[PDB]
Design a protein around this ligand. Structure first.
Ligand SMILES: [Mn+2]
Ligand SMILES: [Mn+2]
Ligand SMILES: [Mn+2]
Ligand SMILES: [Mn+2]
Ligand SMILES: [Mn+2]
Ligand SMILES: [Mn+2]
Ligand SMILES: [Mn+2]
Ligand SMILES: [Mn+2]
Lengths: 384, 384, 384, 384
């Protein structure tokens, strides 16, 4: 279960580099030089790294400091063969963003948020990133009067439309991936789920330039089924990036290593990504727990990839097993894939087998055989 | 706080008529004749009633029994002046629907589900309903292998497209309202939130014929902010119906009377409906608790309307209060409503006040004054 | 992974016998004769069965009907070698219990609830049960004024005290196991968690006669860690029975087969039961999903036991692995087991190594190595 | 609704003094001098302040710095008439506590945690505090192997027993109040609810010296009913302190001002505290949102007290209303307060009205009238 380049595993600088600050505790680890993280991740078999502007370039850097940080980072990438497939903006840490970036009530803040973003899109392109994530962690409210959501969605559409105009005007080959989250750090976050973000994208001027960046933990913070949401994103053709991690139910954002948390959901997610032929990077947005020293940081990172690969093997074995294929037919998964009424509406209307002569009791007596199927899936997951 | 016809309060037959069966208990009340419910609701000041096919016409009725049930119902409506603004299909109670209606794995069931629906659309039109709700409570799964969600969404789009074709071919003035719910009775339900349903609608052949029917409790079962979801539905122009009730957090679907549950969310919801000028019926999908006899049934129903009207008065007083209007300006809600960059992208790019000369620390020092605003809102809610 | 008698797997009649009624759907399966369930469970390798009074004897039976039902059941038990280790009362299904049994506001109902219980304790003893469960599913409220909880806890203590007096007066070798649940079917249930039930027991007249009957799903409906709660029950010496099943987070009570739901929690639970030497039956309180016919019922039951046995093997392999034993020392689990201050208070107070000479920064630098440990646990669980 | 000294409202230094650091954001406010917070709180009508050791004395202070900080604080208290009813230890912020204080796996850390605590108990007594809170926010785990909970509970009992020995040996008039929380900052926290803490206390050597310090938000993070848990604490005689704030459901610990969050639960809590005659301080453990400047800090604090007083008036009006008193009898709350069987077990056993002649159907027909009662409560809450 040793990772390879084709596996395309990627990590945020802010993941392994998380110093361990939490709402109730100080840092437990020293800051990492992004150069060291690139080296260490490459040695573990990662394919690439991602960044927030402020992870790579200290906030408020001069042009000359900016240049030197980027230079050093590029040398590490060249030294290791690591790629930079995705970048994003930090529009959440600095106090100025306490009520939002793109949907701050203060118009001057909204404009500043756009200018910060646009500066880093230029950098992202310079580094070869083809995806630009946006997680509006500060867009939202703690109280009902603080944020008129219709006006906020107008400001959010305005901002993304301006960004689409900018990338189009520059001829850039980059697309955006909007990351939902239901809450934390705001009491409620705008675009709280995969669904709300998919729906919002359809109202943008250039919808083709935007997709979702769903995160395992975030949908689970709403008690939603993350494989189901990914399936809807896939169905819509909007899965432009994914964040992989673990989460134990409805609570604060834990960002556990991938595999931890809801293990059966991790299994079904890998099954779906691999079955659908998803071609994007398998990106980890996780935090080694603050209990850990650097050895545990690298162990946690390695474990992300290991778990993905173990689940990939098990899901593959599940789908290739003739007994599972038989069970899937027994449960009528083949029938679900066939059109209800390719014969068309009139034919349906005139088909007495769909109504007057439909034997409801005979149909109702038919078992779905879902338990046997799911125990086959469990046996495969556990290698039993 | 006495309801009037213009208030347009409506109730499902299945609401006050709920006999009190729950997962662990038998009925506590006798079945109600829909005629009696129409009479009683009218006496309380309701404007109309809604129905599932199977609430009005016992499942498996002959044509002559069908005719007589509808006749009796129409006499009660004519006797009282009650309207029937909305109808829907029961695609969840009968065993044949145990794996779904429109997304059942069995194709014969999917066709039967469409034919059942289409029959009741004809009835709904005969009774004057302009909205046709669809709550796919059985669409989903308990286990991961049981339901391929991409195939299920294909079958779901197929079904709604056929229904759109049918209403178009008949020249009917009816529109559909899809009701999300995250779970219960399936382990996970497809289209689990307002967002997922909005997104799904945009993929239908005739999107203009479909909106959402969000329910207070259902979004709350995912710990989501129901006023926020309604705001997004409004923003999209897709709020075609609403279900009002109460829910105490993330747990089974309680369907408490409106006002109960999250009271502050009820306040903010009423504020939003009234401020936006929502013109649809204020429909209650609630269940008088099984502890109650018929006197308590009618008390619970009355309480739905009373709470709506008390919250309407308080929200109106909040928005009309010059001190609140001052607080809203202090918190920059006026600024949120103004375009970020009506000057356009280039102007933004060339505006040094948005970047080089933006004083982040001065901006960050500015308080949002949201606490004073929210205590004004609380004072208004409580009449303090 | 074939079950044996020493495995002591037991099932409620109401588990495999669940006809599939849910809040939104009719039964999907016919009623099972308890005789058939005993036969079928024995063929799968179960050790015994448990019952509610009303599962074995239809409510309202005459003495002669009572005798004949018990006779038939006893013949099946004798035919199969199945045991009856536990019984309980149905104080939740009949309408009379809509506000509770022991804590109903109506005193006449409370007395009736006690008499119903006492009748079935006599039967339980006749059948050899040594544990008598009590799940007060109707004890609680939907609204705040309906139930004064201090008075309710007085009535609850009164009832259990009377039951303790009764078993003592009869010389019966039976102990009680109180089953917490946070909600459903009441909006909030009294004694909502393992903790609240442990605390309540300590106030009873004869605390030694009462323990907890925790259920996996029930603690998870509060987002609690079920292995942690079991550990506290074990620590207190109060784990008198356990209910095993699966649950996918904070939602309605799903009662999935054991292993389903939170798989990693199932692993840690089995590890704890086996490591602690728990000697009670491994009882399943689960419901085969209503999608299933009888073949799927028996498959689901078999799967409960299979998953328990697969997890037992993996946990055993984890604890026996010298590499895990090394990791556990690396993480200082050995140190957690040693007294903080067996030297006593004064010695602690006078120990400069505990304060003036304690190097906080050196201590803080020490990693806990928990990630490596947990990846060893994951590898063992998955057989990787 | 102006607060008075008899109202006994108290605040933690760390509440109004919270600088606004969250998991995703830097401080938005400068640090407050505890002297200024004492002055400002007194001007708002608070009765007193509480502290963690590290809120009053910077961690690592010399004896002379310690003395000067305490001196300044005592002058402000004397200047204002403010009291210090409660103190506590910070055993969560410093890295050394990343795996716990009293239940850290490292024994040297456990001893250090005890010595830190004991030092501040001496200070607490010097300042007149009669209650000493303990919130073990770091006691727990993110993974299953990291923490053997039985061993941890042994270490936790050891620590509290040593503290009880210490206060007894010194002749101090101080009692402990253990604060449960279900999670955050650990994945699961030991003693996660009021119930688990009540149960744990009963196993200590000197149980009379320990009670609970329940926090509104914390029980709500488990979706529990906070008034119910308080009622059980009251019933047990163990409510030694309370933390008041707001929380919007199952999510991260929000610490909103009291009244915010679940308003109806705030109503029922105040009703219960006032009806039971609770005599402890009404302590607020809340955080003004980081959106706010200092004006909003003081507004938020004022709002805590205002909401408590508005709810007190409404609850009082509810209980004094003859119509409510009539409704409470109609719902049989009087009967719930009367013994089930003061006649004793034998009498119960011989009472044919409790069994053979109990008319279940007549009893079951009786409505509980809970909806009318709850609408009276709602009308009172809203002043309608
Ligand atoms: Mn996250
Ligand atoms: Mn992410
Ligand atoms: Mn509902
Ligand atoms: Mn509804
Ligand atoms: Mn259950
Ligand atoms: Mn159970
Ligand atoms: Mn808190
Ligand atoms: Mn607290």
């Amino acid at each position: 279960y040793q990772p390879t380049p084709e596996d395309r595993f990627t990590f945020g600088l802010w993941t392994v580099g998380w110093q361990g600050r939490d709402p109730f505790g100080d840092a437990t680890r020293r800051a990492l030089d992004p150069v060291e993280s690139v080296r260490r991740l490459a040695e573990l078999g990662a394919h690439g790294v991602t960044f927030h502007d402020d992870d790579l370039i200290p906030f408020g850097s001069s042009d000359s400091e900016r240049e030197e940080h980027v230079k050093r980072f590029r040398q590490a990438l060249d030294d290791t063969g690591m790629k930079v497939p995705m970048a994003t903006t930090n529009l959440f840490t600095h106090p100025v963003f306490k009520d939002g970036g793109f949907t701050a009530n203060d118009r001057d803040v909204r404009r500043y948020a756009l200018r910060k973003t646009i500066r880093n899109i230029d950098l992202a392109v310079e580094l070869g990133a083809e995806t630009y994530v946006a997680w509006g962690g500060r867009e939202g409210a703690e109280s009902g009067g603080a944020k008129d959501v219709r006006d906020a969605l107008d400001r959010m559409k305005e901002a993304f439309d301006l960004l689409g105009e900018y990338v189009t005007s520059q001829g850039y080959d980059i697309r955006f991936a909007i990351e939902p989250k239901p809450n934390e750090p705001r009491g409620d976050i705008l675009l709280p789920t995969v669904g709300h973000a998919l729906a919002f994208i359809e109202r943008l001027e250039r919808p083709e330039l935007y997709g979702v960046n769903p995160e395992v933990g975030h949908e689970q913070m709403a008690g939603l089924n993350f494989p189901h949401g990914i399936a809807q994103a896939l169905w819509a053709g909007k899965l432009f990036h994914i964040d992989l991690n673990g989460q134990n139910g409805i609570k604060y954002d834990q960002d556990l290593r991938f595999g931890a948390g809801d293990l059966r959901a991790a299994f079904w997610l890998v099954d779906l990504l691999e079955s659908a032929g998803y071609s994007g990077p398998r990106h980890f947005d996780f935090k080694p727990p603050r209990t850990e020293d650097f050895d545990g940081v690298w162990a946690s990172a390695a474990g992300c990839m290991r778990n993905y690969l173990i689940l990939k093997e098990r899901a593959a074995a599940f789908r290739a097993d003739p007994e599972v294929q038989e069970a899937l037919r027994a449960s009528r998964l083949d029938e679900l894939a066939r059109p209800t009424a390719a014969d068309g509406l009139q034919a349906l209307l005139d088909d007495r087998s769909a109504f007057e002569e439909f034997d409801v009791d005979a149909a109702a007596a038919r078992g779905m055989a879902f338990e046997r199927l799911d125990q086959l899936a469990m046996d495969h997951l556990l290698g039993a």
